């Protein structure tokens, strides 16, 4: 009885590609199955060489369609997404629904990692809860999505050489084993190794610093070099931080920031970019511009 469900998920993906949200029960079942699938993944999800790394989207559905056009459709080309799909977007619901549907359908092909914005407090304060309420009239879909976010992996490691994560390094994390020991099944705390992994950002200063965002820490080139040498890593890929060029090298090419939300909030006007890793892990970048187009 799996073929009928495969067809149902395929037509769900088709409808979502048309910019049409799913029903409440459909979203509930899809989130249940996404939880059942993600519970088997480790904190440091292992990914193989052929893959495409992407930055933040933030509900920009049309820009996600443009990203797919530039990199290719989800079935064939593999993707590794580093989080952030909620709030600060008109079509956040359709974005998250399409992404979780592709994950459930092609768990092997596409990968997804949690972001700091994928948190009950952040989603409520920044307006994803508002979008869910407007589109469904209640908070059931929001509750399901926030419960699913708790199961999203925190970091990924492709080819055992390139470390991918949303935020950055943490002063309480020295080895990948420390990350594998953390308990991801919980809301993003206000501090600790998880919050640092989901909030940290590079820094031009040396040593550790206090993040101006009020959460996480700031790290310099020396910290990234030490982490890479202790973990045997070649490059630390991250997003979270907005960049004018979409992608940006820093810390002597030891850390790379990727941003896939072009013209962030229709004001930043920054370009978007994606990072492709071929069969032998050799990297390449592809830049693109935004897709052209009472109280009750």
């Amino acid at each position: 009885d799996e073929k009928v469900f495969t067809k149902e998920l395929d037509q769900w993906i088709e409808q979502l590609n048309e910019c049409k949200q799913l029903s409440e029960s459909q979203v509930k079942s899809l989130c249940e199955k996404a939880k059942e699938i993600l519970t088997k993944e480790s904190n440091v999800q292992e990914v193989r060489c052929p893959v495409t790394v992407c930055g933040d989207v933030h509900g920009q559905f049309h820009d996600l369609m443009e990203l797919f056009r530039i990199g290719g459709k989800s079935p064939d080309t593999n993707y590794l997404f580093m989080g952030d799909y909620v709030n600060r977007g008109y079509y956040s619901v359709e974005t998250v629904t399409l992404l979780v549907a592709l994950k459930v359908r092609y768990r092997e092909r596409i990968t997804i990692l949690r972001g700091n914005h994928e948190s009950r407090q952040i989603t409520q304060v920044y307006g994803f809860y508002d979008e869910c309420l407007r589109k469904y009239g209640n908070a059931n879909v929001w509750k399901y999505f926030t419960d699913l976010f708790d199961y999203l992996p925190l970091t990924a490691l492709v080819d055992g050489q390139i470390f991918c994560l949303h935020g950055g390094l943490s002063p309480s994390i020295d080895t990948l084993d420390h990350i594998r020991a953390l308990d991801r099944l919980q809301e993003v705390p206000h501090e600790g190794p998880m919050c640092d992994l989901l909030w940290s950002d590079p820094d031009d200063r040396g040593g550790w610093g206090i993040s101006p965002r009020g959460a996480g820490y700031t790290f310099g080139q020396d910290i990234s070099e030490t982490f890479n040498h202790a973990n045997g890593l070649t490059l630390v890929s991250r997003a979270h931080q907005l960049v004018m060029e979409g992608y940006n090298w820093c810390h002597d090419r030891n850390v790379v920031t990727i941003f896939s939300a072009p013209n962030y909030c229709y004001r930043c006007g920054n370009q978007a970019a994606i990072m492709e890793l071929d069969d032998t892990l050799k990297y390449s970048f592809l830049q693109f511009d935004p897709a052209p187009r009472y109280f009750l």
Binding site: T6, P50, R69, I70, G71, G72, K73, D76, T77, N78, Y106, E108, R109, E276, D278, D279, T280, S284, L286, P292, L296
Partner: protein
């Protein structure tokens, strides 16, 4: 009662504390109203529903639309008057949506009211709504004059005219705006004498109102009055109004006139047009605002196309072209973006002798601008010049520019050039593009983006059938099979797709002769992506093959791939086997 009991729907099932339940009740009330009986219904339900409902937008709109749909359940065309007091009381509410829906339902049911019932209830209804103290009733009353004026007695309409005049002369801007907006619908009064006598002064005073919204609405509705074609009087009745409105300071009115220039010219006439609108258009296109100039540049094509064919060449060469130089050279970006997608439509009208001398330089200048969207719009409708200018004369000038810009940074420009190529390639010759435009196609096929590769594949599949299978088996087969030796899987999938996209057109011969070995060899790729994309393509190339080669070589390969470690490739192979009917 087979349905919900009467007393229940009356008192028990109308507990006004819950909004959702009462909304659903007012929505499904039709099932109970059709069973309660038309007599008892019109006797008790309407006054009860009118008195119990307090003031909530949801139930208000629900009752409004229900009463609008209950025109048939009332049981009698003469008793429809019972549905007028409720709609009237609902129209006096402050909210605009519910009152607009009520006015809509009223104008809809007015067509069913009998003459006696009409003259007895609809006239006093509008008289009472127009005389209301608040502005909402006055704004809702002006929406029923268009339907109640014609189908009433010949003596009462004379008073309806004065009532509408008084309503239009309100001391608030909302009523004035509503009157200016709905005058175009109410202007249809047939009696041209009374029009010219009493309406045109009201229109002139409305066009001179202090509020800009009223002015723009008046100059918009002016088309409904000009459609009468009073050419013998327009030069003195409406022409001065349009003149004094052209040189407007509120600028909004200028934009509204620009957006309605074509609809105006459609009825102003040819002589009045050539006399007044052409200078007016030339002055508007030279305005300081940006929206008016954008609209003028966008509608210049439709204006020139609908111009009299007596001597359009002289007037257009003397008036428009000497002025379009300032627009094409303007610093505005939206104006040029709108002008580029319409200027090319003027190539046939200017004649072959003058178009290639006047529009060609401006066209080339616009094609090489820094604005990407301008070039995109230009190349989008580039298929309108080949039918006017010879292929060789067009290639002498524009072919180098397009084949040079075909490699622009913006991928959308490349996609447009690709999807436009087929026609020009077929019109040039099979040898020209094969000897000169081969490197361009090769660069297109090796692009890292998937959209351009798919567009190139489509162009190839469209040209192969336009030139035959000889050029197929000769030139494109080796050049496409060579790309399969690249390290990037994104390039291998390109050839993997093109193989079957070409086999679906070539036939079984070339397929089983050259492509089948390639696709059955690519199945051994260590990368999972290639070795299930091979099955995805096998699902399509299958029917092309015969029954012999199938059981000869395609069956063992598929049976072996079915045992692959990955689940996705396994499911794809199973689906391919099912579609292939290899039981």
């Amino acid at each position: 009662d087979d349905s919900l009991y009467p007393i229940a729907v009356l008192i028990d099932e109308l507990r006004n504390e819950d909004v959702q339940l009462r909304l659903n009740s007012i929505k499904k009330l039709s099932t109970i109203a059709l069973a309660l009986g038309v007599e008892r219904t019109r006797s008790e339900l309407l006054p009860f529903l009118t008195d119990t409902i307090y003031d909530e937008d949801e139930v208000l709109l629900a009752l409004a639309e229900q009463l609008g749909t209950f025109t048939t359940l009332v049981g009698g065309p003469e008793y429809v008057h019972c549905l007028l007091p409720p709609l009237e009381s609902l129209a006096t509410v402050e909210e605009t949506v519910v009152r607009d829906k009520a006015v809509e339902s009223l104008r809809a049911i007015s067509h069913e009211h009998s003459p006696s019932d009409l003259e007895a209830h609809f006239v006093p209804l509008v008289k009472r709504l127009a005389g209301g103290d608040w502005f909402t009733s006055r704004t809702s009353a002006c929406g029923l004059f268009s339907v109640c004026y014609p189908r009433v007695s010949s003596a009462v309409k004379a008073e309806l005219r004065q009532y509408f005049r008084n309503l239009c002369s309100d001391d608030t801007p909302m009523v004035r705006r509503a009157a200016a907006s709905k005058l175009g619908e109410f202007a249809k009064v047939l009696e041209l004498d009374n029009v010219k006598s009493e309406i045109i002064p009201m229109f002139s005073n409305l066009a001179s109102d202090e509020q800009d919204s009223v002015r723009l609405l008046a100059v918009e509705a002016c088309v409904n009055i000009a459609q009468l074609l009073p050419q013998e009087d327009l030069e003195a009745l409406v022409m001065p109004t349009l003149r004094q409105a052209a040189e407007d300071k509120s600028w909004r009115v200028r934009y509204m006139v620009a957006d309605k220039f074509t609809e105006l010219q459609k009825a102003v006439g040819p002589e009045i047009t050539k006399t007044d609108l052409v200078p007016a258009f030339q002055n508007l296109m030279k305005d300081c605002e940006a929206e008016v100039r954008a609209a003028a540049s966008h509608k210049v094509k439709e204006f020139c196309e609908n111009l009299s064919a007596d001597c359009r060449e002289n007037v257009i060469m003397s008036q428009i072209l000497p002025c379009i130089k300032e627009l094409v050279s303007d610093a505005n970006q939206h104006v040029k973006s709108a002008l580029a997608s319409v200027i090319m439509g003027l190539s046939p009208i200017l004649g072959k002798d003058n178009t290639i001398e006047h529009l060609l330089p401006l066209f080339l200048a616009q094609l090489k601008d820094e604005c990407p969207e301008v070039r995109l719009n230009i190349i989008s409708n580039l298929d309108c010049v080949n039918e006017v200018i010879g292929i060789r004369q067009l290639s002498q000038s524009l072919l180098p520019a397009i084949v040079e810009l075909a490699e622009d940074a913006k991928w959308r420009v490349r996609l447009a050039i690709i999807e436009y190529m087929p026609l020009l390639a077929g019109q040039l010759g099979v040898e020209f593009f094969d000897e000169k435009l081969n490197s361009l196609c090769m660069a297109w096929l090796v692009d890292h983006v998937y959209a351009i590769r798919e567009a190139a594949t489509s162009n190839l599949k469209k040209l192969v059938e336009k030139f035959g299978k000889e050029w197929a088996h000769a030139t494109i087969i080796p050049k496409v099979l060579a790309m399969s030796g690249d390290p990037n899987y994104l390039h291998r999938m390109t050839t993997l797709f093109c193989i079957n996209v070409l086999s679906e057109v070539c036939g079984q011969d070339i397929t089983t002769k050259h492509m089948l070995p390639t696709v059955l060899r690519m199945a051994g790729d260590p990368v999972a992506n290639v070795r299930f994309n091979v099955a995805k393509s096998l699902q399509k190339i299958g029917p092309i093959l015969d029954n012999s080669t199938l059981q000869s070589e395609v069956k063992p390969i598929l049976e072996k791939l079915t045992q692959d470690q990955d689940v996705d490739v396994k499911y794809f192979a199973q689906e391919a086997l099912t579609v292939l009917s290899l039981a």
